[PDB]
Amino acid sequence: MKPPQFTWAQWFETQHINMTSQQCTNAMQVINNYQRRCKNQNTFLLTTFANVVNVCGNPNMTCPSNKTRKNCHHSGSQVPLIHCNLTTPSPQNISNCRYAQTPANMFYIVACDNRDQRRDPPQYPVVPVHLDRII
Numbered sequence: 193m194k195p196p197q198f199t200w201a202q203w204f205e206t207q208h209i210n211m212t213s214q215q216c217t218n219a220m221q222v223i224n225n226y227q228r229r230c231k232n233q234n235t236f237l238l239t240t241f242a243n244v245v246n247v248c249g250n251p252n253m254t255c256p257s258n259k260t261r262k263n264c265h266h267s268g269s270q271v272p273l274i275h276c277n278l279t280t281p282s283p284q285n286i287s288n289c290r291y292a293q294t295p296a297n298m299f300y301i302v303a304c305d306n307r308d309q310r311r312d313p314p315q316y317p318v319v320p321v322h323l324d325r326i327i
Contacts, residue, residue: 193227199308201319208323209244211236216276216291230278230289235326237300238272244320248304255303256325264324267300273326301325 194203206222213219224230237244247265255264273296280290303322312319 193229195226199311199319200305200321201307201312201316204244204320204322205241207234208237209239209241211238211274214274216274216293217289220276220289220291221287224286224289228286230281230283230286232278234276235323236274236276237323238274244302245316245318247300247302248318248320253301256301261303263303263305264301265304267302270297270299272297273300275326296326299327301327 194200198206206226210222211219212222219236220231220234223234247267250265250268252262253264253266255261275294275296276291277294278289279292280288282288301324302320303324304318305321307313307317307319
């Protein structure tokens with residue numbers, strides 16, 4: 193779920209780029225405090241926002257998660273990543289939700305769209321809006 197103060201691009205950056213600690217339990221507190229629930233699984237890509245914007249310039253392909261959508265783009269190269277998995281729920285005290293961490297080196301597929309006219313910076317006309325698949 194996206195909180196209202198974020199554009200889709202800003203929420204993508206928060207969930208998948210800005211890993212605020214190398215430890216999943218700490219990093220996940222940010223996502224979970226914003227969306228008011230402990231997310232069951234989440235991938236952080238060890239790459240830059242600018243690098244993902246450049247992936248939006250690669251050829252269009254069908255999104256693995258939706259046969260009807262053609263706004264997806266393959267990374268071309270692999271990147272390091274960290275996958276976080278919920279081990280310990282706590283729906284009445286989100287702070288005490290714990291995670292495992294799994295490091296890997298994989299390709300990724302992102303969905304991209306035109307930026308939010310009012311709120312996204314003009315610097316980037318085309319932005320990532322969803323992490324569709326890791327492969």
